[PDB]
Write a protein that binds this ligand. Structure first.
Ligand SMILES: *[C@@H]1O[C@H](CO)[C@@H](O)[C@H](O)[C@H]1NC(C)=O
Ligand SMILES: *[C@@H]1O[C@H](CO)[C@@H](O)[C@H](O)[C@H]1NC(C)=O
Ligand SMILES: *[C@@H]1O[C@H](CO)[C@@H](O)[C@H](O)[C@H]1NC(C)=O
Ligand SMILES: *[C@@H]1O[C@H](CO)[C@@H](O)[C@H](O)[C@H]1NC(C)=O
Ligand SMILES: *[C@@H]1O[C@H](CO)[C@@H](O)[C@H](O)[C@H]1NC(C)=O
Ligand SMILES: *[C@@H]1O[C@H](CO)[C@@H](O)[C@H](O)[C@H]1NC(C)=O
Ligand SMILES: *[C@@H]1O[C@H](CO)[C@@H](O)[C@H](O)[C@H]1NC(C)=O
Ligand SMILES: *[C@@H]1O[C@H](CO)[C@@H](O)[C@H](O)[C@H]1NC(C)=O
Ligand SMILES: *[C@@H]1O[C@H](CO)[C@@H](O)[C@H](O)[C@H]1NC(C)=O
Ligand SMILES: *[C@@H]1O[C@H](CO)[C@@H](O)[C@H](O)[C@H]1NC(C)=O
Lengths: 148, 30, 148, 189, 193, 331, 49
């Protein structure tokens, strides 16, 4: 609102006072053009920002459906680790998700085998792997060490 | 002799009263 | 000296602090972002140029004074239906005696301002000379209609 | 001026200055730039050479008939790198995409447009691909990087602390062996 | 224009419509100069370009022409094969462009590309509507037209190649997308009325 | 049958910067006085182009920085019958990119911009800025990902990497799609042969000239046409007597030259506002592709996904990333 | 003000300080059920007392 835009003054009262009417129309029309463009620029940049906010809102709706109301198997959608559940909290102009996840820890090293042969036939595990404690062989699940 | 004038010589630029602002002006200053 | 300052106003209207924008890079940053505190990061402040250090003028090897005397002060000009074109080349033309003097009633120049004629440098100059009736001088202009 | 110039007024010719940012006037053609010898060859009816944007990039000297290339004087952007007002009042400056030997002498000759009354170029001047970096001390070690300048170069405020510039490290190194009969299984969570 | 029709002579009064491209081929020098004029009589102004074995002389006067000069205005004296010339007249200036090329056959115009450099810009302000070649072994005349060309400049200052932008649809497409090679597809070039 | 297929995705685009005063006015002080009447236009345009340029680095980082820890390339490239030598870097070669990456970098063929390559500058004031992560730093990330997938499998996505033989990884990934383990273990050599043969088919399909990278060349071609329009608009007249500021300044008096300078200023401000608007619109198109590429990298390289047709056609087993100019190629 | 509009003025005669405020303006919105339903409407004057 402060810029001249090539006219004689920013304020329209001085332009109307200092000149005759026919010259005043020509001087006012340049301010009118400049302010129209200064407003159209603002509208266009606001449209481009609203597109981005819509993208974030759609992703937040998907996360609310899949992470909060159910358990999600997609890798790194609902946080690092293996998803268990999630909790929503409100924030000004947004949302905050507290994802609770399971993180394995304290790895151990074992010897492993693809299959064992008992009497001329090969046995494969139904679920899990074969491990070797050092004394005898065992079958375990992959994520926890519970020998069977 | 010569000395230094550190942060001295600023004055009220004009007739206006303003509060709670950071106002940038261009005028003859020390 | 003429400098740019930024001044801080409290609630009662008194100046308590100020920064000088031409002192430091940091003061220019504080004037650019309009604050007395700055976060960590890299902020694009301004643009820089390098000012010139010299001057170079190169005009060719021309020494002859230019015959403007023969074109203007001559015994006979032809009539308008058969005008004459005279070529002027290889001369140093002062050009100031045309607009400094009060000899000429109309000195109207198109595409060139007369005051800048002394600086520009041309390939050839062509002078067309004729004699017209007193009201026919207005028809010597681009894009104009008449019998002449 | 489609032919060599013949008719023009009284102005005194000067010696030409090469590899230096000057204001030039060649046959009424005025500009500001640096002038260098040129490898371009002119046919005799041409007197100057033109770019795509209708700029003149070459000119023929009227006296000696030597073809000269015109280049702009240095310009660009200036960025300021700070650790924070709470930490320190020391800053470093980046002059974007210019040669360091131009800016380093232009500051000393006091011929640079952002004129800072209290400013020292100092000992630390570094040439990066992003531009010329002034006020930051190069170090050999590599860290995860805080302030990204570019082309793999980042700066940070490190130890009497000062601003240092280094090459960023992508991650903490780790090696796990591959054995064809060996597995690892977690025992806790 | 490219692939236009040129009329060949093996001394008629050929008309001068907008310009002429005049190409003369000769083992021995036969075609010496031209005459340009409006009415080719004593009534109107006419210009002659002619070279004798030492000099090239151009004179613009009222001539007697049949195959005494008065009211002279302009005079200039200066001191197989295929000779190509372009003459065009505008704003009282006559532009002459000249190029030379060595060939072998006399009967026909050979196909090829050749660029023409400026020679004369004569400040003589007459209408030129007709011309006659002056002879002491063939010459070809073609007429210029207002067209748009695209010219390719190599790493030096020479025009190696060109396209006429009104010969074909493909040439218009090349001028529209600024190249000599076109990929497969459908491109919108212009509008029709 | 074992089929290996290719997806080509754009991640980032070229950064650029414009000097507003140098494009519009140049070195004129008279033009610089009249440009002050139009307000703060140059600060907005510089701020917008700076925002797009800083966005491109985030686009690259969110895709490729998926590994916390960097794994050295294993010295043996033959895991359980499967030949990994054409997707891992060679131990004895000056370049750090692998074979397929070297084919892809020559597949896309990338004046008058004004960038430092020797720092050179142009009269129009435009510049192309360099990326933060170079080509070697991106090839290091993709080499770490391919090494981790071969050694530790799916485990390093969700925690610390746990070693496992490659045949047992393939048995687990066969259990994923409903087929039992004894299908893999009895027929292991045939599956290894099909894997090697499909990799060799991919190599010759890239070696033969192709339009398979037509999505990454279009990112190159759209930037180039964006700038040539901006440069060519310097030659337009916009109603003045001439399109060059020096001749208007040289042949005319100051009061007469004010109008002719205003015509050029009004034209060039519009020609620059249009460019900044279109770049803001195009960066939002690049961002969607970068987000989808990050999702594919998380869900298909560091895991196995059950979503239909998200990763190839068929039943997903494994996926490998490769770096291509301005984008990523998933196998 | 912060937007460089005049918000306060000292009275020349009395030396009294007084505040200028803009008198009310805004948007007018019309709430309707539909022409086929009824011809009654409600009026909302936005952001005003
Ligand atoms: C597996 O055994 C090797 C050799 O003893 C050892 O270096 C490595 O740490 C073990 N693996 C793990 C995950 O500890
Ligand atoms: C492994 O586990 C079995 C069963 O608990 C036990 O008998 C054996 O001693 C263990 N091995 C070692 C080395 O402790
Ligand atoms: C403004 O004046 C009042 C009245 O004395 C005083 O209490 C107050 O502290 C002043 N404001 C500041 C910021 O000092
Ligand atoms: C012009 O004059 C200078 C001064 O003597 C001389 O060096 C130069 O050769 C001259 N050039 C021509 C073209 O006569
Ligand atoms: C797992 O960690 C918890 C807490 O750190 C500890 O109480 C527990 O004993 C650990 N389990 C094993 C098997 O060491
Ligand atoms: C040759 O081209 C001209 C061009 O106008 C045309 O008038 C003439 O008819 C053409 N001659 C033949 C034989 O096609
Ligand atoms: C050519 O003609 C000119 C013009 O009359 C004349 O001066 C010159 O001597 C002539 N040269 C000859 C006849 O060789
Ligand atoms: C330009 O001229 C040089 C000098 O003869 C020549 O060697 C070169 O081939 C020319 N350029 C082209 C593209 O032919
Ligand atoms: C793996 O592939 C490479 C490249 O095709 C080949 O040179 C090498 O011999 C292969 N390794 C084998 C067959 O063990
Ligand atoms: C800087 O200038 C020097 C001297 O001209 C030159 O040797 C060097 O290559 C330049 N460096 C860059 C990056 O432009």
């Amino acid at each position: 609102l402060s810029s001249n835009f090539g006219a004689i003054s920013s304020v329209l009262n001085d332009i109307l006072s200092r000149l005759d009417k026919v010259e005043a129309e020509v001087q006012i029309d340049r301010l009118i053009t400049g302010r129209l463009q200064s407003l159209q620029t603002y509208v266009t940049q606001q449209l481009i920002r609203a597109a981005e906010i819509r993208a974030s809102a759609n992703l937040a709706a998907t996360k609310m459906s899949e992470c909060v109301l159910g358990q999600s198997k997609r890798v790194d959608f609902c946080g690092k680790g293996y998803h268990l559940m999630s909790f929503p909290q409100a924030a000004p102009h947004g949302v905050v998700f507290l994802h609770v996840t399971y993180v394995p820890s304290q790895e151990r090293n074992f010897t492993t085998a693809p299959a064992i042969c008992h009497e001329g036939k090969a046995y494969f595990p139904r679920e899990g792997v074969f491990v070797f404690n050092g004394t005898s062989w065992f079958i375990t699940q992959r994520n926890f060490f519970s020998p069977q | 002799t010569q000395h230094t004038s550190s942060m001295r010589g600023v004055y009220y630029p004009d007739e206006i009263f303003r509060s709670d602002t950071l106002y940038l002006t261009q005028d003859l200053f020390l | 000296k003429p400098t740019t300052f930024m001044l801080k106003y409290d609630e009662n209207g008194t100046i308590t602090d100020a920064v000088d924008c031409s002192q430091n890079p940091l003061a220019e940053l504080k004037c650019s972002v309009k604050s007395f505190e700055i976060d960590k990061g890299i902020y694009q402040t301004s643009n820089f140029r390098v000012v010139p250090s010299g001057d170079v003028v190169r005009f060719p090897n021309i020494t002859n004074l230019c015959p403007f005397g023969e074109v203007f002060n001559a015994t006979k000009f032809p009539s308008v239906y058969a005008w004459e074109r005279k070529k002027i080349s290889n001369c140093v033309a002062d050009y100031s005696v045309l607009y400094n003097s009060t000899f000429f009633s109309t000195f109207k120049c198109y595409g060139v301002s007369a005051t800048k004629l002394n600086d520009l440098c041309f390939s050839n100059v062509y002078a067309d000379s004729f004699v017209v009736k007193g009201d026919d001088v207005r028809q010597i202009a681009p894009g104009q209609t008449g019998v002449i | 001026l489609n032919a060599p110039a013949t008719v023009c007024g009284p102005k005194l010719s000067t010696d030409l200055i090469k590899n230096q940012c000057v204001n030039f006037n060649f046959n009424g053609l005025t500009g500001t730039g640096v002038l260098t010898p040129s490898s371009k060859r002119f046919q005799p009816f041409q007197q100057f050479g033109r770019d795509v944007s209708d700029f003149t990039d070459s000119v023929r000297d009227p006296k000696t008939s030597e073809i000269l290339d015109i280049s702009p004087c240095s310009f660009g952007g200036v960025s300021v790198i700070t650790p924070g007002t709470n930490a320190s009042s020391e800053v470093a400056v980046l002059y974007q995409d210019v040669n360091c030997t131009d800016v380093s002498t232009a500051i000393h000759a006091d011929q640079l447009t952002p004129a800072w009354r209290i400013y020292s170029t100092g000992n630390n001047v570094f040439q990066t691909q992003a531009g010329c970096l002034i006020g930051a001390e190069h170090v050999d070690t590599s860290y995860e990087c805080d302030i990204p300048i570019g082309a793999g170069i980042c700066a940070s405020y490190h130890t009497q602390k000062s601003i240092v510039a280094y090459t960023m490290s992508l991650g903490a190194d780790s090696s796990i062996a591959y054995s064809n009969n060996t597995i690892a299984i977690p025992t806790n969570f | 224009p490219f692939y236009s029709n040129v009329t060949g002579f093996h001394n008629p009064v050929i008309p001068f419509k907008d310009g002429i491209y005049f190409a003369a081929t000769e083992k021995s020098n036969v075609v010496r100069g031209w005459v340009f004029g409006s009415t080719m009589n004593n009534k109107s102004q006419s210009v002659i370009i002619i070279n004798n074995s030492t000099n090239v002389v151009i004179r613009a006067c009222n001539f007697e022409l049949c195959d005494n000069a008065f009211n002279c205005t302009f005079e200039y004296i200066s001191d197989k094969h295929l000779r190509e010339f372009v003459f065009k007249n505008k704003d009282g200036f006559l532009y002459v462009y000249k190029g030379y090329q060595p060939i072998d056959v006399v009967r026909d115009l050979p196909s090829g590309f050749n660029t023409l450099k400026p020679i004369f810009k004569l400040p003589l302000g007459i209408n030129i509507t007709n011309f006659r070649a002056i002879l002491t072994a063939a010459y070809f005349v073609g007429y210029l037209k207002p067209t748009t060309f695209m010219l390719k400049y190599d790493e030096n200052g020479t025009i190696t190649d060109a396209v006429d932008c009104s010969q074909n649809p493909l040439a218009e497409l090349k001028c529209s997308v600024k190249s000599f090679e076109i990929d497969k597809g459908i491109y919108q070039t212009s509008n029709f009325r | 049958s074992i089929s290996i297929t290719t997806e080509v995705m754009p991640v980032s685009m070229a950064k650029t910067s414009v000097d507003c005063n140098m494009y519009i006015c140049g070195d004129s002080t008279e033009c610089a006085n009249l440009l002050l009447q139009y307000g703060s236009f140059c600060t907005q345009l510089n701020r917008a182009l700076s925002g797009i340029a800083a966005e491109q680095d985030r686009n690259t980082r969110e895709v490729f920085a998926q590994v916390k820890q960097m794994y050295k390339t294993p010295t043996l490239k033959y895991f359980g019958g499967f030949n990994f030598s054409q997707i891992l870097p060679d131990p004895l070669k000056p370049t750090k990119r692998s074979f397929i990456e070297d084919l892809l970098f020559n597949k896309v063929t990338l004046k008058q911009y004004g960038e430092c390559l020797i720092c050179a500058q142009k009269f129009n004031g435009l510049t192309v800025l360099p990326p933060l992560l170079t080509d070697d730093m991106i090839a290091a990330y993709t080499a770490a990902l391919v090494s981790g997938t071969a050694t530790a499998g799916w485990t390093f996505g969700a925690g610390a990497a746990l070693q496992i033989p490659f045949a047992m990884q393939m048995a687990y990934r066969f259990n994923g799609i409903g087929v039992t383990q004894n299908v893999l273990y009895e027929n292991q050599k045939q599956i290894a042969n099909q894997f090697n043969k499909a990799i060799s088919q991919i190599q010759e399909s890239l070696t033969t000239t192709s339009t398979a990278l037509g999505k990454l060349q279009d990112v190159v071609n759209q930037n180039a046409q964006a700038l040539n329009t901006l440069v060519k608009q310097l030659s337009s007249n916009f109603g003045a007597i001439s399109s060059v500021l020096n001749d208007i300044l040289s042949r005319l008096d100051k009061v007469e030259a004010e109008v002719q300078i205003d015509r050029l200023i009004t034209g060039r401000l519009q020609s620059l506002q249009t460019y900044v608007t279109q770049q803001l619109i195009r960066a939002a198109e690049i961002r969607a592709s970068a987000n989808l590429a990050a999702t594919k990298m998380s869900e298909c390289v560091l895991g196995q996904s059950k979503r239909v047709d998200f990763c190839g056609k068929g039943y997903h087993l494994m996926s490998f990333p490769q770096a291509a100019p301005h984008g990523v190629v998933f196998l």
